[PDB]
Amino acid sequence: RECISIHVGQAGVQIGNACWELYCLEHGIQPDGQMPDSFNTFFSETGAGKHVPRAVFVDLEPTVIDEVRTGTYRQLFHPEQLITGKEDAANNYARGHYTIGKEIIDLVLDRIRKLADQCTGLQGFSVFHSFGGGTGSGFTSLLMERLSVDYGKKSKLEFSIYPAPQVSTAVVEPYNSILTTHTTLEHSDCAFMVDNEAIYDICRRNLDIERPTYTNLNRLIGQIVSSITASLRFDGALNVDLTEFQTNLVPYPRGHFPLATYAPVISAEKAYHEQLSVAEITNACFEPANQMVKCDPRHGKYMACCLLYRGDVVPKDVNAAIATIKTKRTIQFVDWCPTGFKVGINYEPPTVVPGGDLAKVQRAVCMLSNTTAIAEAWARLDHKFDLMYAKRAFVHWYVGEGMEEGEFSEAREDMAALEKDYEEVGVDS
Amino acid sequence: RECISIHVGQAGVQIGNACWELYCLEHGIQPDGQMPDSFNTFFSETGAGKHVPRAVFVDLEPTVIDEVRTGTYRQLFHPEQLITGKEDAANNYARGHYTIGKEIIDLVLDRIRKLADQCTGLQGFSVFHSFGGGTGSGFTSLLMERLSVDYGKKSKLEFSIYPAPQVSTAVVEPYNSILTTHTTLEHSDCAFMVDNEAIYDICRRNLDIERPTYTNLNRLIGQIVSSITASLRFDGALNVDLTEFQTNLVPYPRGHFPLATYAPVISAEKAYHEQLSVAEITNACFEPANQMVKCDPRHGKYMACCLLYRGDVVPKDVNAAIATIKTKRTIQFVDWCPTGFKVGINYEPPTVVPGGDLAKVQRAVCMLSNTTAIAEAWARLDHKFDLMYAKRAFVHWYVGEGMEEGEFSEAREDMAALEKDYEEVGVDS
Amino acid sequence: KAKKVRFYRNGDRYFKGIVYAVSSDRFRSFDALLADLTRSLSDNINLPQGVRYIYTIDGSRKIGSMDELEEGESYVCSSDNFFKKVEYTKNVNPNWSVNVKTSANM
Amino acid sequence: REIVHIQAGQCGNQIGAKFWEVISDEHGIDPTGSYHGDSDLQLERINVYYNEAAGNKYVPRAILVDLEPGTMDSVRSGPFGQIFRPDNFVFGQSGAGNNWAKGHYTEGAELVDSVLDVVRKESESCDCLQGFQLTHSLGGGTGSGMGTLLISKIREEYPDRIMNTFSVVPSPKVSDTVVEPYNATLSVHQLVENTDETYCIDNEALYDICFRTLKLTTPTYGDLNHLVSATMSGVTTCLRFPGQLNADLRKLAVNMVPFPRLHFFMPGFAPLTSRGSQQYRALTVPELTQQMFDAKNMMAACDPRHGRYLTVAAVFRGRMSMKEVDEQMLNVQNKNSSYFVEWIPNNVKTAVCDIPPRGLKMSATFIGNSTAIQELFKRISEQFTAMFRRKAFLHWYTGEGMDEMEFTEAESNMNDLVSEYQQYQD
Amino acid sequence: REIVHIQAGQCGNQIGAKFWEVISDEHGIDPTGSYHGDSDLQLERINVYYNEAAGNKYVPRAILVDLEPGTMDSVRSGPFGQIFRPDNFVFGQSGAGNNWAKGHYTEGAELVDSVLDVVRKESESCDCLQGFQLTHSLGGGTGSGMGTLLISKIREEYPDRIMNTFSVVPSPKVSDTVVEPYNATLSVHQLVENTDETYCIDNEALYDICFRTLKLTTPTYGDLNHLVSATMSGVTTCLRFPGQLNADLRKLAVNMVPFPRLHFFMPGFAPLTSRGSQQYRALTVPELTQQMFDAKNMMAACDPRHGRYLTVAAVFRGRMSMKEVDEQMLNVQNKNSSYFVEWIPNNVKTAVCDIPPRGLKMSATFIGNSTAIQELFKRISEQFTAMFRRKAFLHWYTGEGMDEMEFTEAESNMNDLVSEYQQYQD
Ligand SMILES: Nc1nc2c(ncn2[C@@H]2O[C@H](COP(=O)(O)OP(=O)(O)OP(=O)(O)O)[C@@H](O)[C@H]2O)c(=O)[nH]1
Ligand SMILES: Nc1nc2c(ncn2[C@@H]2O[C@H](COP(=O)(O)OP(=O)(O)OP(=O)(O)O)[C@@H](O)[C@H]2O)c(=O)[nH]1
Ligand SMILES: Nc1nc2c(ncn2[C@@H]2O[C@H](COP(=O)(O)OP(=O)(O)O)[C@@H](O)[C@H]2O)c(=O)[nH]1
Ligand SMILES: Nc1nc2c(ncn2[C@@H]2O[C@H](COP(=O)(O)OP(=O)(O)O)[C@@H](O)[C@H]2O)c(=O)[nH]1
């Protein structure tokens, strides 16, 4: 029934604090834990008057988890559930996975085994990491790694924030992301992806603001995510379990990575304008300028979409708005796939931050999907890697951290067959 | 019905003052003796206002018993019952047992014969000593010695604080503990053991505090002990007499030494957190990081456990929480033992010091048991001995105190068959 | 793929066992299979602690590795177990594995 | 006589709430209340769907099978939700994965025994059992897989009592799921070989019939369901009422199935007029046959006009002339001799109850066995191959302990089923 | 007629409080009060369990034997605790050690004479004695040892009056003690050779039956006890009521014991439904036999379905048709011909009281003599050997003046007892 969550890496933690915020916000549970089953699949009723968090937090520098235990919400989690390794983060996979990151893992696991026990027939762990980091790429790599073995019998949906197409940060980023992909690939169930840059566009083009603090992108994913777990694990006219996803969403064992998209992104101050039609939002979903991912459907044929709706929506409206789409053709779906539209309908409309910059409509569409499109995104990120590896660039930083020419070269070959995979499962009939 | 207690050795006296504190504290009897049968098995209703203790205190330096007759509680005992030998303590068995300790014994006994008479059909003497001391090892050795003969027809449960595995104090410690074991072995009924160091861990790991004063460890045993006598000799839904123990707890005449363990050890300041489940505490009992003894079940197969519960507990909850355990297998119980689980249920929940550092739950599990584990603890403590004896080290200190190459060598051979005993009764089928 | 097997409980001569699937993706080892078998065969008459070991159809040797599990096989659950040995199970069709038989045109 | 409804899956379940929402009112049974029945006739035959315990508590004798708690916990936490004895709820808190294989071989197969258990407690209720009603969707786990199992077991336990199946065959235009043809082809397979009366409904055949035959602009699911439940009430329950010429499941079965496949029908209700205005009352009778026999108005997706009929059963329920009924049916049989198959002199099976749908004057359920439904299994069967060919989302099946020959089997079977049906269109 | 209860040990004692808690209310006897009896029939036969002294003080005629003061001093310091005449309390302030040997040869052997003394004061009470009720646990000192002695003496003093024994045989899964099989094997031995009717209850067969047949989530001991005491009331006391067809200890004995061993039964109560909801009232009768004869619901650990029956005694107590009773029993005997042994044309012993359990409409105690209980003494007997072999905690016995041949004896005896019981399963 439930779904634990492990927010790994400063980022996965910032995004975590965010997604975690939106939560209580739409569940009437003040930062003090108290509200005045349903949603029990994400919150344990420690008694008692409180709620607490049904997740954990893993960063190797204290800085970021520290800030959580300062700002209201400080009261929300258990002093325990926020894991730290005073040591060093290191923007390098190796160190975070092998060398350092190792020391903490046990302890980490312990919670996802201590928190996994306390519950009642769970469904999986929504993992939150930032592909191109040290604690986010490496660590998790083995966290998800140690999970796929300790609970192979569950769902492993990892929600990632993969490398901005041109606006990356770390100098090595690809090293860290070609490595988190190959190690997690054979361990995840469904990997959701939200592109940091391609989200900015949305903040520039669909909300207008050249002042987007990280704290915003987080509010956004913090939204799209709320549409995944939160509301879905919440009763409705067309419920969709976590398993449901991976089933209706992955055509093949590769921990396939769909893309997250939201429909109503419109800025407060617009807040009064006449609302958008069920048809418009539906249509907005097929626009490559509103998908939290720089993977513009440049050719990538969709192969399965899970249209999660929430708010006031008439099933016919959908079983029509989608019909219209199924026949737009310029939206070309894979061949071997007749119908690939999982319509998920929830009741409770979205819930926008009291005064951030999100419109606040009475219905939204968080559609996610597997698109032969990422054939690109992976490509462009793989190429990166080579260029540097081709010269070993910052290689001495990993080797000296318990890695080898193996893990790199052998994780490169890995993704290679991910460029062929995402190519074969499509483009051909 | 009752059970006298003889706190021997400064330590056994410090722990005594502690266990003795917790008592009145949960019986509404201010330090003035007055409260405004049941518990009569530990307190005599002397005069017509008071509650004179039901034990005695034996130390060869005044310092420690002196402090009792300064600090409130000063009013609690009878000026008489606190025996002292102004002379010298001496951190050496010999002197305390033979030479000096001898002079006092008579007098000592007299009280445990004067206090043993006054009562009504007693059950035994809960003895409190500190294995590796002078007054604690030696003396008692002959105290328990002179008891096994004067009242062979009773229970002799000695509650010991055996030598910290690496953090011992006295330089000789083993000499004093291989000697208190061999002399008491053929005289005790059931010897409870609480490891001083392995309790610190609990203060570091399960309560958090690098500032643990002896006055704390004492509050702890002062707790686990309260679960033994106090509450048990106190009515309940599944009473357990002292005899009960030794019967359900010792498979063989060797004054077998079970280990004390408590379930709810959580620090005040945590005091508000949602309480732990009947299942969790039960489970906490099978964790080698919560047992007041550095005898981590490294292999030692349990052979009998006396789960004493107290507070709000449903017999099914137990006759289930235990069932779940009986089938964890990784908790491997001896062969020749089908079922070795004495479920002791009391009513009144625990009673934590007003403001020490103990959580204060509404239910706890003071489980004690005989584990083939001590095969270790004894081993590691025996070896110690040899090393020194192998060179006579501080031998001249005992010889010159009425002992001989006999008592040592012949008490070494003694324990030898305690390393074989605790080996044979287990590890084999 | 996985391996189809018919798991019987030692000393039952009544229950026709329960059919389980076994592979490397489902169960990392025999202890993990046995863990799920404790839940699916959970009892207190034929099996003491539900399921602690798996024995051959005759009970001559207990399996310790998943590599010894063949498709369309028959196994017994034990915990001592002492063996009656109880066979039993019979009789059932081998149609749990596959229907050997078919329909015919009668 | 009697029957025991079966709410397999969510859909089949969601509908349960509507089938019972209705039926009850068509039998004066309030939530937990008793028989408030405006009349006295809505009681002499109730047994068919309830049981006597208290004396005011006639509890629906159905089964609620589902591997997703939330669902039954929405049906049990709403309106009439508190009438079913808890014993009826056979839940499977497991992961109700959308896999036919996950609810038929791995997850459902466990929960089955704990179901059959009850399906027997209800069957061995009392008097004489007739058959079981089965609701579900052939486009999911708990529906097609686990429900399709429930029957394969039922039909081994009482190959005597009948088995009506109400399936929500995967609507064309848009599929409310992705593997749909997988979960479907696999369940139809099980159907063509166990139940002996299937009434296939299409969420979009309904919309249409619900947005143009009922100017209804916002046809919520509740509605669709409601419309469907309206037909299944006319069928069963209805005939368990008096009538100049009454029939019952069997008659319906023994007059509608020329060849053992089991064959699937397509239900159609009579007065289907928009609220206010339309309330034309043009319901003398030629108006009902006008209705029932038109293309639109067939809950099925396919259009009758696209293939002969083998049998038809106008189960009317409202005082009318056995003459204006028996007569109309004829002209109808002659104006359309073209499509109505010939080797059956009188395809039509006129049935006639007396008491009508509570608030209406005259209605008539239509149960057509037309060869047109060929053009649907075709559809389904197509979708399969187009995706089977590439084993699309097959790993979710096999990985659940399935077979590459299992899918082959079903398609073929159900695919042949298309073939046969044409053997009569010609 | 009459009987004199015997509360041996703590358990047997703890239960005394529950057996008398009940029984009294089933006889309108308040703490020290008299007969407030809602009726007038709960008095004409009380004698069976009380005595006339004052005129409002009918004191329970039982014995409270125990070597642990605290216990009886908890039963005597609580609710109904102040109804027993102090003379009844035969305590042994000694060390009630958990050793069968300590309460049968060394410690108990002393307190015995001071018991028999009273067991005679009560027997020679008045009218005619029938037998004695004995409660205890075969997993401790004062229970198995001292109580097993109390009978060996009783059965020498009146080999005429009967001896029902209510034993709490050591539950499987988890034992509430360590030597358990020692204290047990040794007491069963004494049982198979003195008492002639034993009703074995299992603390975990109860939990189950109390946590799933009574959604009861926190089944305290009081409960278990309470459930048990519910059965022993249906047995005795009950039959000492009128009935179309009434029986009494003997009938029960003379219809249930084919072979002198004494044989042990397994009691089962009838209406065992959870409070609020479940209050289905499905108690016409087929519902009671449905109950009673299922696996779960047998206070024993073993499951009937695992071995034929020799005899059965449905001691019903609530107005019903000697037809729907006598009848049901039959089908039951034919649907399960498999397990019900054949060399007894009518295994079942239908019994029928009139007045039911105070607040209920219809109940029926079940006393089964099935061969299934073979698979329990096996258990016990196993545990012994596995530990006897190594003389585990044997020094606590011998050191108390025991014999290495004593343990041998019992095991064998009780072990053979397993053998025999199979002689009929075949
Ligand atoms: N959406 C979003 N992206 C973020 C956030 N914080 C960081 N990122 C992105 O995630 C990556 C940064 O990872 P880092 O913060 O360097 O590292 P980390 O993954 O936390 O772990 P370490 O390298 O050991 O410190 C960059 O691509 C950032 O653009 C955030 O709050 N929201
Ligand atoms: N838990 C606990 N352990 C104590 C306490 N006091 C001392 N100990 C331990 O007991 C041993 C010390 O014994 P000592 O105080 O040296 O000696 P004694 O046994 O009182 O007798 P003498 O040697 O004659 O003074 C060491 O192992 C200490 O760690 C106390 O208050 N609590
Ligand atoms: N008429 C109708 N169709 C429904 C309802 N619910 C789901 N469906 C249809 O059922 C299919 C989905 O299967 P679903 O019921 O979710 O499967 P399951 O719940 O896993 O057994 C889609 O084609 C939906 O249109 C409903 O309440 N009424
Ligand atoms: N049903 C039931 N069992 C009990 C009660 N008390 C102890 N037992 C069982 O009796 C066994 C222990 O023996 P005990 O009664 O303590 O022996 P004694 O008191 O020395 O004679 C365990 O198997 C317990 O589960 C009770 O009040 N009810």
Numbering used by the authors:
A (entry chain B), B (entry chain F): 2 to 37, 47 to 439
C (entry chain I): 51 to 156
D (entry chain C), E (entry chain G): 2 to 44, 47 to 360, 369 to 437
Manuscript excerpt for this entry:
Doublecortin (Dcx) defines a growing family of microtubule (MT)-associated proteins (MAPs) involved in neuronal migration and process outgrowth. In contrast to other MAPs that bind directly on the surface of the MT protofilament, existing evidence demonstrates Dcx binding in the recess between protofilaments (Fourniol et al., 2010; Moores et al., 2004). Cryo-electron microscopy and subnanometer-resolution image reconstruction reveal the kinesin-dependent conformational variability of MT-bound Dcx and suggest a model for MAP-motor crosstalk on MTs.
Strikingly, in our new structure we found that linker regions on either side of the well-defined DC core adopt a significantly different conformation in the absence compared to the presence of bound kinesin, providing important insight into the Dcx-MT interaction. Crucially, in the absence of kinesin, there is clearly post-DC linker density docking along the DC core (top). Flexible docking of available N/C-DC structures—including the post-DC linker—into our cryo-EM reconstruction confirmed that W146 apparently contributes to docking of the extra density against the DC core when bound to MTs. This observation strongly supports the idea that the Dcx density observed in our reconstructions corresponds to N-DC. Interestingly, in the absence of motor binding to the MT, the post-N-DC linker region of Dcx is clearly docked on the MT through W146, which is consistent with previously reported results (Cierpicki et al., 2006).
